[PDB]
């Protein structure tokens, strides 16, 4: 019942220093805008952004509760939208069921009655 | 009773990361040019599956040293194995209701083929009735 | 009794307003606006009336859409989206690229906006639309717009806040194998009467549907190149088109069986570089360490669940033996376990898998195959 209680706090300690590096990127974010104010800047080219997909960045410390925290907000919501997937699917399966019952004896009253029809065309 | 303070601090930690490790690589961009940045849907996918594969790759760092040694870790075994346990319905009840669902549709065309045709038939039966 | 709904509307004629066409769609502008009672035994009336009566189904759809009347309830114009959209033709053969593009985008704007919470308001539109191409693609003379809606149907699926390891909630991925399914139903049929150009997603949105966490959608991607082998075959491959599934079958085939995955070229273009700057800053640092760790992710052959839940029920209900010591294989802990660890104890109480790993995904990857219960995933060497 303690165990638990040490992860909280290494669990805030983490999510506070990856608040702590988003505040600073996004501060730095701006820093070569307020140089010459163009806002479009169209030239990325594939000769220097080939190189960003081959560098990461924002590696792990060992700390790591990154590592549990990926499951328990995927592996939860996985099988909780899947049992609401079945409720929706089976009460459209049995709506329609519901219709085809309605509309195939339909199918039947119409060619009985232009047999019928076409036996009074018949005689005139 | 102490598992929701987990799921709710757990929800705000993914999220801070994934906006992290958008931000964070943009700023690279950022600092390599002047201003110089846009980037269309052509190159904007290759720059998100990287952050899909990484990410994922980060995934396979408890399946490799946390369960291998069977341990009784009551936050962090149990859980992990009464919960991973679980995705049990991938199988025959969701993957062939998917089956069943086509299986109705097709009957619910065949029987309108029919109808369509039958009054489009029947009509040049009632306006050639006399009076 | 139940006739007279119908012999009403064939008295006079059709595509004029008689009496059923005008009380249907007064049903309509009056169940939208809460003042009426609730309409859940108004609309069987209406998803009666309005099955097959194409002057009257091309008449709700150009209404009752595009977010005029969507912010009101939203709660019933999906069960309609069930009702009508299944069944129905197109004979203004030109105007309709140009609507449910704009309708599907005004869906998307609102439905992953405010609430923050997906709970059902996309995705099963997206189904319905997703159905009723199966109606069009089934017919003649407008597979032409079905194979042209379809390409940025899944174009729209596959954007980012909807489909990630973040948050989930599944309705892209099974929306997605349906979505793929259609396609790969119209791969199997005979009469070839359509360009290469129709029929394969391509590398911008479904790179990125393949790299995904849930078994059964990788299953589906699989199903299409077992079955898109077929009738690709016939044409000259050298270079026209079919350079894009080349590239998804040998890295498919290096991600999953071939393990060459780390010093091999570009697998999904990535510049595996990435690998070995993201490989040597993670633990366990055992000597094995390369092979073992990138090989799958959550559920097919090596490194996943779904591998050691079938093994252990594999040998507990064929020789009840000595059970297994630990949770998911690897190239690694099997053998340091069960070769020097019971070389002589407990040597003969195993499914004679008599050599280490290399048969030991034999003998799950013919049983995944053979037995048709858990999926049909055999795009391993092939």
């Given at each position: 019942?303690?165990?638990?209680?040490?992860?909280?706090?290494?669990?805030?300690?983490?999510?506070?220093?990856?608040?702590?590096?988003?505040?600073?990127?996004?501060?730095?974010?701006?820093?070569?805008?307020?140089?010459?104010?163009?806002?479009?800047?169209?030239?990325?080219?594939?000769?220097?952004?080939?190189?960003?997909?081959?560098?990461?960045?924002?590696?792990?410390?060992?700390?790591?509760?990154?590592?549990?925290?990926?499951?328990?907000?995927?592996?939860?919501?996985?099988?909780?939208?899947?049992?609401?997937?079945?409720?929706?699917?089976?009460?459209?399966?049995?709506?329609?069921?519901?219709?085809?019952?309605?509309?195939?004896?339909?199918?039947?009253?119409?060619?009985?009655?232009?047999?019928?029809?076409?036996?009074q065309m018949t005689i005139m | 009773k102490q598992w929701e303070?987990?799921?709710?601090?757990?929800?705000?930690?993914?999220?801070?990361?994934?906006?992290?490790?958008?931000?964070?690589?943009?700023?690279?961009?950022?600092?390599?040019?002047?201003?110089?940045?846009?980037?269309?849907?052509?190159?904007?996918?290759?720059?998100?599956?990287?952050?899909?594969?990484?990410?994922?790759?980060?995934?396979?760092?408890?399946?490799?040293?946390?369960?291998?040694?069977?341990?009784?870790?009551?936050?962090?075994?149990?859980?992990?194995?009464?919960?991973?346990?679980?995705?049990?319905?991938?199988?025959?009840?969701?993957?062939?209701?998917?089956?069943?669902?086509?299986?109705?549709?097709?009957?619910?065309?065949?029987?309108?083929?029919?109808?369509?045709?039958?009054?489009?038939?029947?009509?040049?039966?009632?306006?050639?009735?006399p009076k | 009794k139940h006739l007279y709904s119908s012999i009403?509307?064939?008295?006079?004629?059709?595509?004029?307003?008689?009496?059923?066409?005008?009380?249907?769609?007064?049903?309509?502008?009056?169940?939208?606006?809460?003042?009426?009672?609730?309409?859940?035994?108004?609309?069987?009336?209406?998803?009666?009336?309005?099955?097959?009566?194409?002057?009257?189904?091309?008449?709700?759809?150009?209404?009752?859409?595009?977010?005029?009347?969507?912010?009101?309830?939203?709660?019933?114009?999906?069960?309609?989206?069930?009702?009508?959209?299944?069944?129905?033709?197109?004979?203004?053969?030109?105007?309709?690229?140009?609507?449910?593009?704009?309708?599907?985008?005004?869906?998307?704007?609102?439905?992953?906006?405010?609430?923050?919470?997906?709970?059902?308001?996309?995705?099963?539109?997206?189904?319905?639309?997703?159905?009723?191409?199966?109606?069009?693609?089934?017919?003649?003379?407008?597979?032409?717009?079905?194979?042209?809606?379809?390409?940025?149907?899944?174009?729209?699926?596959?954007?980012?806040?909807?489909?990630?390891?973040?948050?989930?909630?599944?309705?892209?991925?099974?929306?997605?194998?349906?979505?793929?399914?259609?396609?790969?139903?119209?791969?199997?049929?005979?009469?070839?009467?359509?360009?290469?150009?129709?029929?394969?997603?391509?590398?911008?949105?479904?790179?990125?549907?393949?790299?995904?966490?849930?078994?059964?959608?990788?299953?589906?991607?699989?199903?299409?190149?077992?079955?898109?082998?077929?009738?690709?075959?016939?044409?000259?491959?050298?270079?026209?088109?079919?350079?894009?599934?080349?590239?998804?079958?040998?890295?498919?085939?290096?991600?999953?069986?071939?393990?060459?995955?780390?010093?091999?070229?570009?697998?999904?273009?990535?510049?595996?570089?990435?690998?070995?700057?993201?490989?040597?800053?993670?633990?366990?640092?055992?000597?094995?360490?390369?092979?073992?760790?990138?090989?799958?992710?959550?559920?097919?052959?090596?490194?996943?669940?779904?591998?050691?839940?079938?093994?252990?029920?594999?040998?507990?209900?064929?020789?009840?033996?000595?059970?297994?010591?630990?949770?998911?294989?690897?190239?690694?802990?099997?053998?340091?376990?069960?070769?020097?660890?019971?070389?002589?104890?407990?040597?003969?109480?195993?499914?004679?898998?008599?050599?280490?790993?290399?048969?030991?995904?034999?003998?799950?990857?013919?049983?995944?195959?053979?037995?048709?219960?858990?999926?049909?995933?055999?795009?391993?060497?092939?």
């Open positions: 019942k303690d165990v638990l209680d040490v992860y909280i706090k290494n669990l805030e300690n983490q999510i506070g220093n990856k608040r702590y590096f988003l505040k600073q990127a996004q501060g730095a974010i701006d820093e070569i805008t307020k140089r010459s104010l163009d806002t479009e800047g169209k030239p990325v080219n594939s000769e220097v952004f080939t190189e960003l997909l081959r560098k990461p960045m924002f590696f792990s410390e060992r700390a790591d509760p990154i590592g549990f925290s990926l499951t328990s907000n995927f592996l939860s919501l996985r099988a909780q939208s899947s049992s609401e997937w079945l409720s929706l699917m089976n009460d459209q399966s049995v709506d329609q069921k519901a219709m085809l019952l309605l509309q195939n004896n339909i199918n039947s009253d119409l060619k009985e009655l232009l047999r019928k029809l076409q036996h | 303070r987990i799921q709710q601090l757990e929800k705000e930690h993914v999220e801070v990361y994934r906006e992290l490790l958008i931000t964070l690589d943009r700023l690279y961009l950022i600092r390599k040019h002047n201003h110089a940045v846009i980037l269309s849907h052509t190159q904007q996918r290759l720059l998100e599956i990287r952050h899909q594969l990484q990410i994922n790759l980060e995934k396979t760092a408890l399946l490799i040293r946390l369960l291998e040694k069977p341990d009784n870790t009551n936050v962090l075994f149990t859980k992990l194995q009464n919960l991973l346990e679980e995705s049990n319905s991938l199988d025959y009840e969701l993957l062939q209701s998917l089956g069943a669902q086509s299986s109705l549709h097709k009957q619910l065309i065949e029987s309108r083929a029919e109808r369509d045709e039958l009054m489009s038939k029947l009509i040049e039966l009632s306006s050639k009735f | 009403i509307l064939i008295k006079n004629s059709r595509d004029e307003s008689s009496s059923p066409y005008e009380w249907c769609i007064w049903q309509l502008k009056r169940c939208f606006a809460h003042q009426i009672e609730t309409p859940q035994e108004v609309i069987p009336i209406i998803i009666s009336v309005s099955s097959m009566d194409n002057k009257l189904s091309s008449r709700i759809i150009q209404t009752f859409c595009n977010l005029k009347y969507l912010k009101l309830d939203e709660l019933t114009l999906k069960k309609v989206c069930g009702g009508i959209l299944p069944l129905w033709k197109p004979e203004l053969i030109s105007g309709t690229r140009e609507f449910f593009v704009k309708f599907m985008a005004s869906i998307f704007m609102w439905s992953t906006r405010d609430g923050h919470d997906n709970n059902c308001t996309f995705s099963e539109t997206c189904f319905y639309v997703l159905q009723m191409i199966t109606n069009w693609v089934l017919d003649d003379k407008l597979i032409a717009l079905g194979l042209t809606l379809l390409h940025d149907m899944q174009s729209l699926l596959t954007l980012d806040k909807i489909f990630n390891n973040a948050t989930s909630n599944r309705f892209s991925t099974m929306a997605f194998i349906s979505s793929l399914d259609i396609l790969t139903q119209l791969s199997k049929q005979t009469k070839s009467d359509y360009a290469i150009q129709y029929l394969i997603v391509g590398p911008d949105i479904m790179n990125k549907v393949f790299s995904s966490d849930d078994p059964l959608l990788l299953s589906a991607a699989c199903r299409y190149l077992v079955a898109t082998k077929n009738k690709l075959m016939q044409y000259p491959s050298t270079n026209k088109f079919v350079r894009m599934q080349n590239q998804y079958i040998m890295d498919l085939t290096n991600y999953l069986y071939r393990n060459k995955v780390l010093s091999s070229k570009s697998l999904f273009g990535v510049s595996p570089d990435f690998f070995k700057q993201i490989l040597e800053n993670l633990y366990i640092p055992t000597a094995d360490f390369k092979n073992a760790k990138f090989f799958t992710i959550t559920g097919i052959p090596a490194l996943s669940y779904i591998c050691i839940i079938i093994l252990r029920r594999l040998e507990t209900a064929e020789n009840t033996k000595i059970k297994f010591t630990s949770g998911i294989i690897n190239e690694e802990t099997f053998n340091n376990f069960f070769r020097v660890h019971h070389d002589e104890i407990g040597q003969h109480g195993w499914i004679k898998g008599v050599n280490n790993i290399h048969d030991l995904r034999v003998k799950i990857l013919m049983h995944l195959s053979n037995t048709a219960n858990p999926y049909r995933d055999i795009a391993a060497f092939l």
